[PDB]
Design a binder for this molecule. Structure first.
Ligand SMILES: CC(=O)N[C@@H]1[C@@H](O[C@@H]2O[C@H](CO)[C@H](O)[C@H](O)[C@H]2O)[C@H](O)[C@@H](CO)O[C@H]1O
Ligand SMILES: [Ca+2]
Length: 162
């Protein structure tokens, strides 16, 4: 698998007050930086999401989404998550996508900071697509604690069959 060019980043919210965690940090190929949902007041509640345009080249269809948690500490990583994909011809930009359709994939991540890979069905649109990665709930401050209400992602990407 090969990494797919990403562009046109969007997020349901982002924290820039309590720390510097804007949406761009989930796409900069740097495991030491992350996007964080907004938790300073007025805070954002679940679900949280990130969205981007994936451009695998004409003729190709993306194969998977990868997710890398923040790497400094465990602080309630994503648990149940969902992936939406729409053809790029459906809207002018990521921000113009109103209807994401049914999820093409769901996963329950284990309690960890290691890289997660979500395989996508071979029936999704080929070509350039808009992608939304959505965190519906989260792990707790420990593995058996009540789930937290925020989210953080160090790296998000699409891959394609090389
Ligand atoms: C600054 C710090 O270490 N704070 C701790 C909390 O961690 C922060 O949590 C907020 C969300 O509430 C952000 O996620 C931020 O990035 C984290 O550093 C931690 O959740 C609590 C409980 O252990 O202690 C705080 O001290
Ligand atoms: Ca990063």
């Amino acid at each position: 698998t090969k990494d797919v060019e990403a562009s046109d980043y969007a997020a349901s919210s982002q924290e820039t007050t309590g720390e510097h965690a804007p949406v761009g940090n989930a796409f900069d190929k740097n495991a030491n930086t992350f996007w964080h949902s907004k938790y300073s007041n007025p805070s954002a509640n679940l679900p949280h999401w990130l969205a981007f345009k994936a451009s695998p080249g004409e003729g190709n269809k993306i194969a998977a989404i990868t997710h890398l948690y923040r790497q400094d500490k465990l602080n309630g990583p994503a648990k149940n998550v969902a992936v939406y994909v729409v053809a790029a011809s459906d809207a002018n930009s990521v921000a113009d996508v109103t209807n994401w359709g049914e999820p093409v994939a769901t996963a329950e991540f284990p309690y960890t900071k290691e890289l997660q890979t979500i395989a996508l069905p071979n029936t999704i649109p080929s070509g350039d697509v808009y992608v939304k990665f959505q965190i519906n709930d989260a792990w707790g401050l420990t593995e058996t604690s009540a789930g937290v209400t925020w989210a953080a992602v160090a790296e998000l990407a699409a891959t394609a069959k090389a």
